[PDB]
Amino acid sequence: GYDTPLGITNPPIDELLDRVSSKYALVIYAAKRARQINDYYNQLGEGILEYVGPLVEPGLQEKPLSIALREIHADLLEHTE
Amino acid sequence: QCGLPKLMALELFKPFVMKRLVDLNHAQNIKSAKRMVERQRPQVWDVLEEVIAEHPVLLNRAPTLHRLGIQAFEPMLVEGKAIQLHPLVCEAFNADFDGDQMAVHLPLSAEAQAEARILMLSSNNILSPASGRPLAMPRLDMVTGLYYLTTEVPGDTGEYQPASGDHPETGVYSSPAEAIMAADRGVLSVRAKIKVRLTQLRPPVEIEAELFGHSGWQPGDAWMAETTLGRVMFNELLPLGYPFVNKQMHKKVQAAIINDLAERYPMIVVAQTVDKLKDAGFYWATRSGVTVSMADVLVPPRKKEILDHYEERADKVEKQFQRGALNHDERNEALVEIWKEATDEVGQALREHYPDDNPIITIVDSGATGNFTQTRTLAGMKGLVTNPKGEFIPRPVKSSFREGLTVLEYFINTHGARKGLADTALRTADSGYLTRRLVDVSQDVIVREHDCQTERGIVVELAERAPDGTLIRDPYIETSAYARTLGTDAVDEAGNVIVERGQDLGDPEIDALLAAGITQVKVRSVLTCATSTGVCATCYGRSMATGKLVDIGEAVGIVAAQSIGEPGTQLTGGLPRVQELFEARVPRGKAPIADVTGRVRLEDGERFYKITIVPDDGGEEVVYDKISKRQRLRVFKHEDGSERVLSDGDHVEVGQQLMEGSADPHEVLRVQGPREVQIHLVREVQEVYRAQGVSIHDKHIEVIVRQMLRRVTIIDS
Amino acid sequence: NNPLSGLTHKRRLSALGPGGLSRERAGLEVRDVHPSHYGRMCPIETPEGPNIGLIGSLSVYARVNPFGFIETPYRKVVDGVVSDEIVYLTADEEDRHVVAQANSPIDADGRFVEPRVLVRRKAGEVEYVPSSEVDYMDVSPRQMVSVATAMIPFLEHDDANRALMGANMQRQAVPLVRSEAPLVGTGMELRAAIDAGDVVVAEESGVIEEVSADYITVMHDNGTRRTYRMRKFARSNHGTCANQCPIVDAGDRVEAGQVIADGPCTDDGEMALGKNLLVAIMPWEGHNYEDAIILSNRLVEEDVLTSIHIEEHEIDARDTKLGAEEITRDIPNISDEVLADLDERGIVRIGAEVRDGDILVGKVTPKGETELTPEERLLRAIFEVRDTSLKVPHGESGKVIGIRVFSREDEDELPAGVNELVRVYVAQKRKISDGDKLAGRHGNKGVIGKILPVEDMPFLADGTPVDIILNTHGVPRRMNIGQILETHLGWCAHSGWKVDAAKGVPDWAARLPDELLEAQPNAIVSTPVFDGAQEAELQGLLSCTLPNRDGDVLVDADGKAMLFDGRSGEPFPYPVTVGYMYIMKLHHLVDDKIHARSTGPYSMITQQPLGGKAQFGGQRFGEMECWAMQAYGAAYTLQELLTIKSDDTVGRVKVYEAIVKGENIPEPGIPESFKVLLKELQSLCLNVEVLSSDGAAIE
Amino acid sequence: MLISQRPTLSEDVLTDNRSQFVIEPLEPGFGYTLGNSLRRTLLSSIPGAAVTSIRIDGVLHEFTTVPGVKEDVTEIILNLKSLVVSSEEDEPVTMYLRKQGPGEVTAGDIVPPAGVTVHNPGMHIATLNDKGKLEVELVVERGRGYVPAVQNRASGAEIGRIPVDSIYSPVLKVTYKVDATRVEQRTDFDKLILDVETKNSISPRDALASAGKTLVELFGLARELNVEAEGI
Amino acid sequence: LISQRPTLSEDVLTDNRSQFVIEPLEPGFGYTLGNSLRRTLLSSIPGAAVTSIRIDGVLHEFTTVPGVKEDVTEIILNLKSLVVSSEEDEPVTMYLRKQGPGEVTAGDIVPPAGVTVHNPGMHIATLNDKGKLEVELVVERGRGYVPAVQNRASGAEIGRIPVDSIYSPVLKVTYKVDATRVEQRTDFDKLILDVETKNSISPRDALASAGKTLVELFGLARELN
Amino acid sequence: SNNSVPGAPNRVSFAKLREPLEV
Amino acid sequence: WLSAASFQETTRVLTDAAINCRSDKLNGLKENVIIGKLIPAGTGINRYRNIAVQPTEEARAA
RNA sequence: CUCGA
């Protein structure tokens, strides 16, 4: 029920704040998942026990933070408070 | 979005550019990638785009008064060497474009990027944390363009005509597209009142009910409206399903619409709708005929006819002073009161002389910017000017800036102008210092609990009831009722509860109480929150920026400090009164208080003043000693008459202010208790800030007052 | 910056200094205007920063007496009769009489028309008084203002705030490549320019024997010759270009005191601080939103607001502990391609264009072996002078126009321990850019937000597109009606006018001098301050504006004309105020004010990045900005700002490494500045200790 | 002069009779130069047919209500004005529409004479009540753009005939916007965005082609003077 | 009410200015065509202009030549007014050698075959007894306004002085429309375009270049998908 | 006439009052 | 004492601190800002600080 | 020191 979110407003911040309790918690979720994704892209050619790769299909040259944020929007992650 | 120069981003993302260059084998090693970036080889500009993609950056403009002085943006590479800023955030940054500079910071860690993307993005910070009203809204040219196309012109071309004689109804269009074509040919004016069949705009909830009602209006359902093509163009910008508004878009109207959109609709919708409003407003401000010309600054027609009749009363006092009938110091007040009525009568002579085609009037009456007093000095008369002493000069500035000041008129204007600049510098200094004090006293005040669950609230005067039966809205509803949370169920005359306890008093939820006959509420306050260290969210209420219950962890103390310190820049009581209150000094007014409720003992003379109270119950007489230079406050006596000047025999309650002034908070504490002194501080400070046109929510002040009374002293170890 | 800046600077009156007072000892009373400053110090021209009121400019007719007080001239009034006798009075001398305002109606003989006249009286009291009471009267209306202030047309219609801004920004004008005198002047431009001394006036009358771009020789009447040398492309103190050009030609008769060659911001001997631009006062698609400015790329194409700037670069070759620094073209590990533009000495050659970072002077300094990194020593083994060449700083670029070399070997006396010194002069030709700051004479300032193509600009009826678009909203708030008037007269001066002389002189122009009833296009005029064009006369002149070459009158008697949107073609629905306004290029250009830093120097003691663009420093994240962060709750951003991005000695290095590696950002360490705090608190005999959760002091 | 290559036109279909067109990238600032021309050519220079005037039986000087029908005269005129029609005869053509008894009147209940063709037989016109009867005559002409009803004052005879605004243009609503696109290094090039909503008489592709052809001939009038230089 | 394909006729005002009348045009259409043609004319008309210069005794712009009254910067500004046309579409060199005393004008330039100066009377410099001026002028063909080609981007060495190139030969374009709004079936616009050039090309040639430009451009819409 | 002392361009002034003393 | 010494009367606070032999429990915004620890507010509080994100068992074929 | 928002 809105115009197509362009650039950095996607995923919509309004839907992101429903899978989470508060603005602040979302930050840690996204950042730590982004760190896991970066370790995946740096440990893809070497080693096992590599952190879980991009769950969703990554756009070409997409920032890890963006991929983790979309994962959050797609209810593909858990948490441990 | 924000636009930064290519060179700026190349230096900022230098290591990122080196990484990507050595990756795509544009450089042999990273060491050579660095030399490439430093020599600015053409490869980087195609690589840099990959690096900056969706990587947010922070923009800061000093002075950083409140948190919206720093916002996050998606960076866009631009040619040139200046930073491109969005026109709506100007208000937040208080940033004009006359040489202002901004700083850019690059968040590095994934966590920094997340914080900027979520917490600090400009689209997620539209509302003012101090008041809850929107900031990134149409403000200047935008509001002018919207006010333009949303105006109803009676005699405009293409107007709707009623069916009469040989022709039926002229000016009745089948589709807004048809009206557009008619305006293109030049038959219809955008601002003419017409009848249009709409098929993609929800009709007002007033008419939707009688036309549909049984089923909500559906996209595709048609209906006739009596608006202007311009108002239709306007209603297409705000989201589908928003009830059509057939109003003239003054600034207040637009702020109201955006406030309702922020309440009801989600964030992103407001973010995009306000951008659409910006585009429309600029397009039409360009084509609104708004221009300044010497001719459009109309001087009053009877201007000389108006001015000699205060040069009179200036001359009157000269011989009531020549024969000695007026003192030299009373003459000044007389002549001041003479010319001050001049300026008002001239304002009245100006409002009617100014036509509505005048562009200055279209600038001011549309709420764009400026008062009518500025237009009085511009087109009427500058009036009485003050010297560096303080009192108004017995001689006015008769000339207007359109007529041409005299030599001496300019010279005497400069006194005030220069001291204005000087004391404004000093005022900003004192304001900033008060600000840092407030910050440090409340820095460690965070929202640590969800609900302390504590009866203690406070009674908010929702509205007053007139003797005839009508309810008068209290002026403090905005700052004392909104964003609160209930402390007592709302009860009308019937047993029905209007609002349940714990519900955020929003706009419609206030209208509920008001239409129910209930005039008092008990609301949860941070004053009352009984938490060991922090404060509970329930007592705090709605986060003014988020529009929802404050999240656990938000540093509300700094937010309160900043919200109070940002407006300090504009003051005159005065700002020293705010300091007197926050430092718990022995005030200037030093007004006494009734230590025991009882009967008043007015024993007034002329040598001195002595007042005693006979306790209404037991007790002994309490004696005071005051100078006859003070005056008794008209206390709302038991007679129900607010104008009851305190005379003997009145029944005053304990802790009642006796004579006018400013009561000593220290005695208020040891008389009425911590609750009452906190309430006193809050609304005594709020008087200063409201008597200057500044709307701070009581929440923020309470946050500070809470810290003032956290400690107690030791009588016996 | 420009001749007027220098003149004003020489006519400054400072309150600060030894024997005067400290800035911390200056109340709101020392700074505000005093009634005795009339005709002596200007109440307008004064900084608006922390030095407001402490620094005035001397009034125009003011002089100093041998005792030190500032005298001003007054005309003696004998018996209600104005005399040409002029006497100079001090402040206390003036207070012992009563003087009349300059603009009092006077008879052609000298008697006052009205019995009552405005009069200033002791203690700064203004009131009317009988004509038989006037002792003296003012010399000129502009007696109270400064040189700069008197250069504001229609000053009597501007508010003191915008007027102060205008008089202060005239001193920030940048000398343009070519200078145009303003259409609308005030009379002060001539004497301002001449007295400023940056022009060339003939000392004695004669004729011009031989004139060159280099010098001008004057053959006097008696037989002597004097040659004035022009100062060509000289670097001003503030990087503006001082360049004098001859005005007269060969074999021209010239009188004594005439300007034979004018310098920067001058045209035929008048102060030309800016250009006459065709202005349209309308909003335009938000690009001029509150005080931003829109310009026609014509001003870029025809170098209308182009200005020259000259930077001085300097390097020396000293004696070091391990030898002596030598300036040499032979630099270690430098390609022959970067050294291509250098002469045999390692000095850049004249005429070479240089970007930021290029080599200008090749200096290598010998470094000792005990100062090498283990990785540096290995890289030296796996493969003694280091590079200290003079490179071009970031953001600089231009043609190398001059070199100066001083060698202790070649007699040149240098400071002890210096063997060679080279100064390189680089000149840049800065066109007007997005973000450069323009301003008028009424404190109407702004930056360039968009430079549109000449076809996009809203153009007049005859196709001539405007040059600059000023937003309307930022006009009636500021109370600078001057520009409005200035604009209208502007147009009148560009087109000219012809008043209807037939059937007598119209009733509005009765007070105009006969020289003003007819004017050719591009005519020069003066609006003397507190005198000059009255609104009525301006209305009339707008009524009698000349038609264009096609016989059409483009502007209405209101002063507005009909414009066409160059982007869509449709004409704009309403008439717009069109005119000519004098706009100055202020010395606040993005080419100078842009800056950015990834990494760079760090202060030794605090280990925090340096400050200033010139040292390649970073921006300061102050206390208030930290409150902003804490407000948002961006904890990690705050930490990252105050640790890895600043003075975390090991954290910043690991961040750089992690960026070039693509790894994640590491965990911030401790700020070295806090270690410094601890050591200082110890230096004050305070035993500070950091305890762990167990209670043991940790080091 | 030389070349300025790779300007491409792409279409995005929103509905069966609505499309967006992107022209990209154009030399600065050609997007603005041609965008307004194309919009005006679409809304004003596409041949179409539409109703010029009508005449309802029983309405001579009241033009207020028709007995037996729920809609008044103006609402009848409004729903008839949206009727889409095409004509192959250049001269005015007369249609009739008659229906008696309760029920609903549609555009399919119209009888088109030879040469004309109705493209929306399902459009609602009126709801007929019990014993309700509606008889109306419709004058159809060929034109372009939108010509108001007042100039059609002569098409209504002084005998019940009512002129109506004529929507001759087959396109209904056109808008456009221009963004900046950087092809190689400079970010000056313009990207033109057309938004065209038309009637089911023609598709957006053919409508845009017609506007392009008319404009090509128009500027060919200037090209036929000398024939010098400009790229491809 | 139907079509009748319009006509374009030319009226000559001066040797470098013409008015063009286009009629009949759809109502409202006149202003758009005036503006479309104006925007193409003012920005995209092929012309020739000086790319670079080279004076013997000079190395950069910020100097003086002995014996000439104007410095190099003023000479370059005086040269910016040079109107020239070229047939080569490749770089071509003009020469100027002149000894003082006298005045150097644009007619003292010797243009190679293919290029031509249209205002030989333009003042360039004033030479005294000791004045000597030797100058090479590199002229290229282009359209619009291209800033001076850098020497770091070009292969030109130090002696070459680049200059801004104002290729556009058109000077001033305006338009007016006469509308026929007689409340009847026939409304129509008549467009009057006004084109003034700088003797480099005639107004008709400029309008023809604009016409070819726009025909080629609008041909993109005719091709389907 | 304005500033008729050195040999400067004739800038015409709207001056109503005469200058008894030059700057 | 660190939060107070950084506000006003630096010397007058440090003397009192050294006399009373005060310990600063590094648990305050000003203090953690001074020493560079995460502020106990917003994203720094313990509720949000220590959190492990794990993907739901749903995974793609590769 | 002088200056810009």
Coordinates of C-alpha atoms in Angstrom, one line a residue, chain B residues 296-406:
Chain B
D296 CA 3.7 45.9 -4.6
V297 CA 4.9 47.5 -1.3
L298 CA 1.8 49.8 -0.9
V299 CA 2.1 52.6 1.7
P300 CA -1.1 53.5 3.5
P301 CA -3.1 55.9 1.4
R302 CA -3.7 58.2 4.4
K303 CA -0.2 57.8 5.6
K304 CA 0.5 61.4 6.3
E305 CA -3.1 61.7 7.4
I306 CA -2.2 59.0 9.9
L307 CA 1.2 60.2 11.1
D308 CA 0.4 63.8 12.0
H309 CA -2.1 62.5 14.5
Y310 CA 0.6 61.1 16.7
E311 CA 3.1 63.9 16.1
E312 CA 0.2 65.7 17.7
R313 CA 0.2 63.8 21.0
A314 CA 4.0 64.0 21.0
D315 CA 3.5 67.8 20.9
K316 CA 0.7 67.8 23.5
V317 CA 3.0 66.8 26.4
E318 CA 5.6 69.4 25.5
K319 CA 3.6 72.3 27.1
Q320 CA 2.2 70.1 29.9
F321 CA 5.9 69.9 30.5
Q322 CA 6.6 73.6 29.7
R323 CA 4.3 74.9 32.4
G324 CA 5.4 72.0 34.7
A325 CA 2.2 69.9 34.7
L326 CA 4.0 66.7 33.6
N327 CA 7.3 65.4 35.0
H328 CA 10.1 64.9 32.5
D329 CA 10.0 61.2 33.2
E330 CA 6.2 60.8 32.8
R331 CA 6.3 62.5 29.5
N332 CA 8.3 59.6 28.0
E333 CA 5.7 57.0 29.0
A334 CA 2.9 59.3 27.6
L335 CA 4.6 59.7 24.2
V336 CA 5.3 56.0 24.0
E337 CA 1.7 55.2 24.6
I338 CA 0.9 57.9 22.0
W339 CA 2.9 56.3 19.1
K340 CA 2.2 52.7 20.1
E341 CA -1.5 53.2 19.3
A342 CA -0.3 54.8 16.0
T343 CA 1.4 51.6 14.9
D344 CA -1.8 49.6 15.6
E345 CA -4.1 52.0 13.8
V346 CA -1.7 51.9 10.9
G347 CA -1.7 48.1 10.9
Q348 CA -5.5 48.3 10.5
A349 CA -5.1 50.9 7.7
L350 CA -2.7 48.5 6.1
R351 CA -4.6 45.3 6.1
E352 CA -7.5 46.8 4.2
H353 CA -5.4 48.8 1.8
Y354 CA -3.3 45.8 0.7
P355 CA -5.2 44.0 -2.1
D356 CA -5.0 40.2 -2.2
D357 CA -3.2 40.2 -5.5
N358 CA -0.2 41.6 -3.6
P359 CA 2.6 39.0 -3.5
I360 CA 3.8 40.0 0.0
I361 CA 0.3 39.2 1.2
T362 CA 0.4 35.9 -0.7
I363 CA 3.7 35.2 1.1
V364 CA 2.5 36.1 4.6
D365 CA -1.1 34.9 4.6
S366 CA -0.1 31.5 3.2
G367 CA 1.9 30.9 6.4
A368 CA 5.1 30.7 4.3
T369 CA 7.2 33.1 6.5
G370 CA 6.9 36.5 8.2
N371 CA 4.4 38.3 10.3
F372 CA 2.3 41.3 9.5
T373 CA 4.4 43.6 11.8
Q374 CA 7.4 43.2 9.5
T375 CA 5.0 44.4 6.7
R376 CA 4.0 47.3 8.9
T377 CA 7.6 48.4 9.2
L378 CA 8.1 47.7 5.4
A379 CA 5.0 49.5 4.1
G380 CA 3.6 51.5 7.1
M381 CA 6.0 53.0 9.6
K382 CA 9.0 51.8 11.5
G383 CA 7.6 53.4 14.6
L384 CA 9.1 54.1 18.0
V385 CA 12.7 52.9 18.2
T386 CA 14.5 52.1 21.4
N387 CA 17.9 53.5 22.5
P388 CA 20.6 51.3 24.2
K389 CA 19.1 52.4 27.6
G390 CA 15.9 50.4 27.3
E391 CA 13.0 52.9 27.3
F392 CA 11.3 53.9 24.0
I393 CA 12.5 57.1 22.5
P394 CA 9.9 60.0 22.8
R395 CA 10.6 60.6 19.1
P396 CA 9.6 57.9 16.6
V397 CA 10.9 56.8 13.2
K398 CA 8.1 58.3 11.1
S399 CA 9.6 57.1 7.8
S400 CA 9.1 53.7 6.3
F401 CA 11.8 51.8 4.4
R402 CA 9.8 52.5 1.2
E403 CA 9.7 56.3 1.9
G404 CA 13.4 56.6 3.0
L405 CA 14.7 57.1 6.4
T406 CA 16.4 60.4 7.3

